[PDB]
Design a protein around this nucleic acid. Structure first.
Lengths: 56, 347
DNA sequence: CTTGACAAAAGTGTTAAATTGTGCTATACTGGGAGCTGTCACGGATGC
């Protein structure tokens, strides 16, 4: 269970940061993941997704 | 009643084993991560283990790794954060090796956890040592980590081998470093093992236990009765003071041990009487020689004074001081034979 | 009490001989284990 956010040029985030509803994800603020959860940066599939999670 | 062993058993029971695919993938991802760190070392001009640990700081927890290494290891805002910022200045080809790195780092953990189910099964035949179940198993897993970092999947060998060899070592080291209450270095443990081994063999054969002659004979060159007896003497371990006694459950051991390292009440008045009577018998000597004696034997500053020193402050030569203390000594020897007060203290 | 000459005691520097610490072994090994009874009264936390 997650939400996908494909990117183009690099990213400002690394695997294991948290999240926020419309915070900068990748490509100079191109896409902003809006949700709660853990962030995964995938080079192969060229996407940075977030699985829904609270930071408890 | 909350068993510590079932805890760990069911804890490792949650993560499933790994077949060929998953294993190879893991190892490859790991080496990829490490070599990625090797290039990233040339990136910002840093070291291997530096950036390698900086990765850990961002993965296996953030504040907690730098918070309790103990009071001083490395500063979090200073020698850590600047490494994060310094490697943030890099383009695509560079910045991606970071993600590769951390990925490999996670792969290492997954690898260790997957094969933990082995290490647990390794320390089970190793019980009966100077350490219990968990205590042994953990020190084995410590060997599993090094078994991981040094492993090469390219040799097409199942990790269950290369790991097991490092566990079988780590435990047999863990015993050498714990074992008996007194610390015994490795080589001693080794020689001891060889000795007991020989014992077990020739006792199995001869139909009875050996002697220091035959056991050292079977031990080879340089081994005599005295040496095997010596190492045998060192072999034994101390005995607890909580040791019970006979039929009585109440009777302990250590209550039978006297304190001879503290002066007995008789010895106090003994040394007092000596130090007194001596001072009384000292006053019959010339003001110089009497002082010279207690300066020579250290009744003054608590230290011996060489003839040179006793003569230095008196202006007299060493020879003079010598003759002085001799003469004074025998002049005491006159009175002592008379009074017979200090003729005691003869031990 | 003194001055010089000397053996022995005690010093100090470099080295030979031990003792001690560390590392690795790649076929494949992938969840331990030992159980022990013939109390007894009571006081408190916990569960129906």
């Amino acid at each position: 269970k997650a939400r996908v956010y494909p990117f183009e040029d690099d990213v400002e985030v690394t695997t294991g940061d948290r999240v926020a509803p419309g915070d900068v994800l990748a490509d100079g603020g191109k896409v902003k993941s809006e949700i709660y959860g853990r962030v995964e940066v995938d080079l192969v599939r060229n996407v940075v997704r977030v699985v829904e999670s609270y930071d408890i | 009643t909350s068993d510590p062993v079932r805890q760990y058993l069911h804890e490792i029971g949650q993560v499933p084993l790994l077949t060929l695919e998953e294993e190879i993938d893991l190892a490859r991802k790991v080496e990829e991560g490490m070599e990625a760190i090797k290039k990233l070392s040339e990136a910002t001009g840093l070291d291997q283990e530096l950036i390698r640990e900086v990765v850990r700081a961002k993965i296996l927890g953030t504040a907690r790794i730098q918070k309790i290494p103990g009071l001083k290891e490395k500063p979090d805002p200073k020698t850590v954060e600047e490494v994060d910022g310094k490697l943030k200045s890099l383009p695509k080809e560079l910045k991606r090796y970071l993600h590769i790195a951390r990925e490999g780092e996670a792969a290492r953990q997954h690898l260790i956890e997957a094969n933990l189910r082995l290490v647990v099964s390794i320390a089970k035949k190793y019980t009966g040592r100077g350490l219990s179940f968990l205590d042994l198993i953990q020190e084995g897993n410590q060997g599993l980590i090094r078994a991981v970092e040094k492993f090469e999947y390219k040799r097409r060998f199942k990790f269950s081998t290369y790991a097991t060899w490092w566990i079988r070592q780590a435990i047999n080291r863990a015993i050498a470093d714990q074992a008996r209450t007194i610390r015994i270095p490795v080589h001693m443990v080794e020689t001891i093992n060889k000795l007991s081994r020989t014992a077990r063999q020739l006792q199995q054969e001869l139909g009875r236990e050996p002697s220091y002659e035959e056991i050292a004979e079977a031990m080879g060159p340089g081994w005599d009765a005295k040496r095997v007896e010596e190492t045998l003497k060192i072999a034994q371990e101390p005995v607890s003071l909580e040791t019970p006694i006979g039929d009585e459950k109440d009777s302990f051991y250590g209550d039978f041990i006297p304190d001879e390292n503290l002066p007995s009440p008789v010895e106090a008045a003994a040394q007092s009487l000596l130090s007194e009577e001596l001072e009384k018998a000292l006053s019959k000597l010339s003001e110089r020689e009497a002082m010279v004696l207690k300066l020579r034997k250290g009744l003054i500053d608590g230290r011996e004074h060489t003839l040179e020193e006793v003569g230095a402050y008196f202006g007299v030569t060493r020879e003079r001081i010598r003759q002085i203390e001799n003469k004074a000594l025998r002049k005491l020897k006159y009175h002592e034979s008379r009074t017979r007060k200090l003729r005691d203290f003869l031990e």
